[PDB]
Design a protein around this ligand. Structure first.
Ligand SMILES: Nc1ncnc2c1ncn2[C@@H]1O[C@H](COP(=O)(O)OP(=O)(O)OP(=O)(O)O)[C@@H](O)[C@H]1O
Ligand SMILES: Nc1ncnc2c1ncn2[C@@H]1O[C@H](COP(=O)(O)OP(=O)(O)O)[C@@H](O)[C@H]1O
Lengths: 41, 526
């Protein structure tokens, strides 16, 4: 009388890597491009 | 020893220090010169709430060891397969890792097992008859001492059933020492009281009329936990009485504040909500005796004299530390009341009463377990007096058949001869109503003596009983006396009580005739 094994509930897909600061950096460059393009006119 | 929390047990500490820690204080050079390993375990057994966890903690904190890891036996068990072993193993990972990291320069660890008797039992020998919890025992045995070596650990175990532990787990390789803690004597109780009242004494919250030395005797078979409960309850009651009285009048708070030193508080806590689990009980007599004893005749005096003689014989004998006595008589003769009165007059420390009322619907095995538990508890004292009631109702005897439960009879027969350990005396009083049947099963020869309690035998005795009860007046008294002048009376006292109660319900004028007719209807001859 030993509770038999149980099937692994399932998989809950969840993926997180290095986006935060990589895209914040990406942004800081576009802003400066915009400023320069504005300045030229 | 009193400098620390625990106090009262010294003969049980000298041995534990010597045979387990002699090598832990000698200079290391000589120890390595001889080359002897330290002890690996010890075992402690005794009644619950007798100062075990405190000693286990102190023995650790005195060795400059790390924090103990408290584990409870029941919590280890689980229904899923393969979790109990993981739980058991989880308690050794830190020690293993530290030993591996630091080689042989590590410190000392500790483990505090509680109720170890529930995860260790004699493993089944027959094929297909193995125990349902053998995996846990196997895992523990392997871990305690296996192929791999551990030399920086110390295992302490606790339990209350030192007979169900697997034999293989007590060989000199694992848990090679044992100790026992009994009920503290008067001196130990006094020491505990003074330790716990040191605070009050220092802060001047104790009175001069409260004498701890005198109060020590008032506690005959108390326990440390019960002492801490008594003190706390007394303080709480003192606070309640203070707030209630001090708010009565506009008197300075300081006068009432110091008033908490009254001895009233302690006596009230004593007789208030302090109900020892190993002491005489006082609230059961009211149920088992409702109207005291009335001396309607001589036999009461003789029975009481015989009871006192038996008590004295058991208290002042050395070759017969076991004494039994059997009470018998006609139905409704009042045996239980006399048994309870004798027990109360015994003046013994431990007086436990066992009755069939508290086993309604119990299976026979449950009744056997209850009997064994009661006897085991009664063994743990220097004196006792057990009272087996009825007997004929424990067995379930019924005239048809006959039928009865064999196992209960066997348990009773076996237990009526087992002797307690050396120096501890015991007394058993049994009450039945059918002595011939008991003689038939060959039980009357197990007891040591018999006593006879008769019923009312003559009319004048009934008149005396009526006079003592005081329910009828002189006119009706004389009327009944002349009506029942002949000595042909045969009635039980309890039946007489019920008959009088019923007769009282009739109309005031038509009572004597009712009572006389009822008495005549009832049996009047043996
Ligand atoms: N001297 C006495 N002897 C016996 N009983 C007495 C005496 N004086 C008063 N009694 C009353 O007798 C009552 C008899 O109690 P109880 O019902 O236990 O009697 P019993 O004969 O042992 O019972 P049972 O008939 O059920 O086997 C007690 O409640 C007590 O109140
Ligand atoms: N000899 C003793 N010295 C000090 N305290 C004691 C003693 N015996 C019992 N006690 C007290 O009993 C209380 C409850 O006991 P506990 O620690 O649960 O141990 P046990 O495992 O025996 O029940 C504790 O607060 C402890 O202080």
């Amino acid at each position: 009388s030993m509770a038999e094994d149980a099937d692994m509930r399932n998989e809950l897909e969840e993926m997180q890597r290095r986006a935060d600061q990589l895209a914040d950096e990406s942004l800081e460059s576009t802003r400066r491009m915009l400023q320069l393009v504005e300045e030229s006119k | 020893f009193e400098k620390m929390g625990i106090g009262g047990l010294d003969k049980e500490f000298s041995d534990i220090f010597r045979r387990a820690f002699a090598s832990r204080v000698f200079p290391p050079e000589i120890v390595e010169q001889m080359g002897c390993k330290h002890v690996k375990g010890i075992l402690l057994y005794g009644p619950p709430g007798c100062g075990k966890t405190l000693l286990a903690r102190q023995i650790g904190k005195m060795l400059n060891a790390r924090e103990p890891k408290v584990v409870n036996g029941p919590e280890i068990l689980n229904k899923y397969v393969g979790e109990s072993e993981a739980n058991i193993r989880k308690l050794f990972a830190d020690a293993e890792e530290e030993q591996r990291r630091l080689g042989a320069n590590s410190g000392l660890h500790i483990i505090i097992f509680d109720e170890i008797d529930a995860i260790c039992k004699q493993r089944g020998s027959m094929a297909g008859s193995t125990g349902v919890h053998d995996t846990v025992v196997n895992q523990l045995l392997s871990k305690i001492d296996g192929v791999e070596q551990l030399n920086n650990i110390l295992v302490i175990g606790m339990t209350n059933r030192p007979d169900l532990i697997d034999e293989a787990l007590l060989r000199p390789g694992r848990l090679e020492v044992k100790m026992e803690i009994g009920l503290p004597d008067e001196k130990g109780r006094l020491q505990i009281l003074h330790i716990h009242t040191a605070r009050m004494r220092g802060h001047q919250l104790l009175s001069a009329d409260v004498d701890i030395k005198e109060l020590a005797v008032e506690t005959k078979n108390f326990s440390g936990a019960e002492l801490e409960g008594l003190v706390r309850a007394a303080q709480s009651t003192a606070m309640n009485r203070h707030i209630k009285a001090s708010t009565k009048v506009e008197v300075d708070m300081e006068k009432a504040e110091s008033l908490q030193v009254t001895r009233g508080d302690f006596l009230a806590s004593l007789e208030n909500d302090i109900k020892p689990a190993f002491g005489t009980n006082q609230e059961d007599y009211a149920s088992y005796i409702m109207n005291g004893i009335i001396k309607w005749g001589d036999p009461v005096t003789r029975v009481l004299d015989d009871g006192e003689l038996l008590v004295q014989q058991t208290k002042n004998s050395d070759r017969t530390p076991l004494v039994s006595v059997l009470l018998e008589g006609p139905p409704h003769s009042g045996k239980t009341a006399l048994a309870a009165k004798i027990a109360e007059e015994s003046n013994f420390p431990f007086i436990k009463i066992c009755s069939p009322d508290k086993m309604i619907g119990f299976s026979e095995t449950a009744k056997c377990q209850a009997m064994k538990k009661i006897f085991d508890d009664a063994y743990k004292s220097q004196l006792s007096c057990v009272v087996v009631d009825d007997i004929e109702r424990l067995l379930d005897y019924v005239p048809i058949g006959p039928r009865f439960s064999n196992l209960v009879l066997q348990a009773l027969l076996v237990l009526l001869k087992k002797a307690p350990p050396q120096g501890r005396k015991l007394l058993i009083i049994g009450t039945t109503s059918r002595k011939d049947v008991l003689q038939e099963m060959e039980m009357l020869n197990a007891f040591s003596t018999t006593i006879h309690v008769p019923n009312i035998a003559t009319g004048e005795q009934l008149l005396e009983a009526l006079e003592l009860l005081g329910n009828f007046k002189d006119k009706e008294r004389t009327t009944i006396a002349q009506q029942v002048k002949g000595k042909k009376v045969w009635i039980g006292i309890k039946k007489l009580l019920m008959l009088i109660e019923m007769s009282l319900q009739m109309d005031p004028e038509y009572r004597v005739r009712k009572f006389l007719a009822l008495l005549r209807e009832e049996g009047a001859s043996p």
